Write a protein that binds this ligand. Structure first.
Ligand code: HEM
Ligand code: HEM
Ligand code: HEM
Ligand code: HEM
Lengths: 141, 146, 146, 141
């Protein structure tokens, strides 16, 4: 599920990201739209050009939702309950697309926090993102 | 796989800067730490218990060097990938029994290692190019199954 | 796909007993209840909110009938599956954007519907045969991607 | 994760299986070895012919471990902690093979409890087995 060593690593390593969360969130979305362009179809009404204020704004939100998740890494399904209601009931994002946004976040961290990205952090941050993806793609409460 | 001359220029340029000793060793090292069940295949490489043992193993780095060699070969002949990875698709399928989801995992760990090394030089356009390569190579190295 | 004459006899015998009106309707009905995100593709079929609405929908049963028709066609020509499912691989890929993991899901729901109907007549040897068919059909209906 | 309606359904439907758990467990393993023969390699020392006492015995155990899981469907990672230690640390089964044994259990139930196998039960029993598969393929404690 998530070892107590992995919970520490996530807290520590996501602490070092800190206040550039907006920017990293944006760059993640941007890599994802370029790399896997069928992911765009969930965002029909956005302006998905280079450097749009819409995308940069959205990335802020995502990055903040993930910050909240790390705060309550022990009781996660309650914290993320509104998001599950959005991504799962209304939008019906299929869970494959979570695996691409989770990939594009790790590439982004590795390209910006080279020192903090040891194997043990890679290993933990991968499980963490995977848990989060599973809460948001299910219908509970 | 359909690459434009700008993408192929980017691929070859940043591939030219790769240190082809350590990258394969790192990539395959990360694989064994992040997707533990993969260790079952290399249990003949001795101790793999702690991240430091996997990164410190000489055989891992040694075997890694061959893997990245095979990516380099397959990056030469983008036109004909199925002809290139013929004996390997047989090797990894008919003898070892490595299931084909694991190929697209190795491909993604590779791309994380490259962004780690090249930092800000690894831009979204470059990434998009390399994602298409390691898709091809994975999708081609497991067609003996289907 | 390599079937022996005993497997092909089993496939055709138990396929001969299938009621080709209800099975497709059930199979596709179960898909929409068990893998909810699949509903996003059929939002043009009106109400899909409660298991009873999905099973009670006429368009679902109607569309189901076509799907099972296409399996029947592909079970005729086991030798040449890629030639059979040519326009569909284009259809499901280039327009609808249904990702290919979903094909092997539909295949597995089908096999559950058949065991539900034929009870103890659906033995392990028969199952093993049909698993190879719905693999082929799924693996062939999504080669336009790779 | 698992809705409270799904927890009920699992309890009720697994209640109706009841005392044929040994036999259903065996038949599940048997379908799996025939259908996906690369799964055999985890069992090198078993006699995987038709009707072996080894397989019939093993199926009893599996079926009982799943019965235990359904008892504690709320605090599952503690209950299944010895199994995780076995399937994940020692054996290193990769998580693909869980998806085939979970498939072959549902085929087996549908071929034996036709009345109890409504869509809502199919839907719940699929999530349940999926949770269990995730606990057993991870290293925690
Ligand atoms: C992996 C973690 C993810 C997190 C933490 C996350 C978080 C969020 C949050 C907090 C919102 C609310 C912002 C708002 O109210 O507009 C949101 C909206 C949204 N998310 Fe995500 N998301 C994730 C993954 C995904 C993925 C993979 C997709 C699609 C491929 C997606 C598509 C959307 C869409 C379409 C919206 C609504 C945007 C709109 O209203 O126009 N999300 N997401
Ligand atoms: C995706 C691209 C991959 C490439 C290009 C690749 C390439 C190769 C090559 C060239 C060899 C021959 C080396 C030898 O003679 O032993 C080899 C062997 C092997 N590969 Fe891969 N491989 C890939 C993926 C994988 C994956 C995903 C696994 C396991 C999860 C794997 C496990 C092995 C094993 C176990 C051997 C034999 C080891 C030995 O005999 O010492 N490979 N691979
Ligand atoms: C695995 C075997 C499958 C077969 C043999 C199959 C067969 C077909 C056929 C023959 C059609 C043409 C019907 C028409 O003219 O609209 C069709 C359309 C369609 N299929 Fe499939 N299909 C398969 C899998 C899937 C899956 C997995 C999905 C979604 C998750 C899907 C979604 C659709 C949709 C949305 C349409 C168009 C619906 C419409 O226009 O009304 N199919 N399929
Ligand atoms: C899906 C739920 C599963 C459950 C609940 C389960 C349960 C169990 C239990 C309780 C044991 C202990 C029996 C003993 O001590 O000998 C066991 C052993 C074992 N399981 Fe599983 N298992 C599951 C899936 C799998 C899968 C998918 C595989 C392989 C494909 C597997 C391979 C094994 C092996 C090799 C053993 C050891 C047998 C031996 O000692 O010879 N299991 N399992």
């Amino acid at each position: 599920v998530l070892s107590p060593a992995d919970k520490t690593n996530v807290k520590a390593a996501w602490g070092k990201v800190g206040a550039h969360a907006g920017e990293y969130g944006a760059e993640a979305l941007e890599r994802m739209f370029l790399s896997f362009p069928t992911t765009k179809t969930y965002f029909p009404h956005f302006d998905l050009s280079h450097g749009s204020a819409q995308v940069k704004g959205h990335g802020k939100k995502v990055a903040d939702a993930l910050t909240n998740a790390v705060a309550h890494v022990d009781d996660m399904p309650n914290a993320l309950s509104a998001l599950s209601d959005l991504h799962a009931h209304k939008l019906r994002v299929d869970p494959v697309n979570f695996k691409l946004l989770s990939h594009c976040l790790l590439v982004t961290l590795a390209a910006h926090l080279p020192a903090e990205f040891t194997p043990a952090v890679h290993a933990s941050l991968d499980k963490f993102l995977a848990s989060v993806s599973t809460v948001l793609t299910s219908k509970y409460r | 796989v359909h690459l434009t001359p700008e993408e192929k220029s980017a691929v070859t340029a940043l591939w030219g800067k790769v240190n082809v000793d350590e990258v394969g060793g790192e990539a395959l090292g990360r694989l064994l730490v992040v997707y533990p069940w993969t260790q079952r295949f290399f249990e003949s490489f001795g101790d793999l218990s702690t991240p430091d043992a996997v990164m410190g193993n000489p055989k891992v780095k040694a075997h890694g060097k061959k893997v990245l060699g095979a990516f380099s070969d397959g990056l030469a002949h983008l036109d004909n990938l199925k002809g290139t990875f013929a004996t390997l698709s047989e090797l990894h399928c008919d003898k070892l029994h490595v299931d084909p989801e694991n190929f697209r995992l190795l491909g993604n760990v590779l791309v994380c290692v490259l962004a780690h090394h090249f930092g800000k030089e690894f831009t979204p356009p470059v990434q998009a190019a390399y994602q298409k390569v390691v898709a091809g190579v994975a999708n081609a190295l497991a067609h003996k199954y289907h």
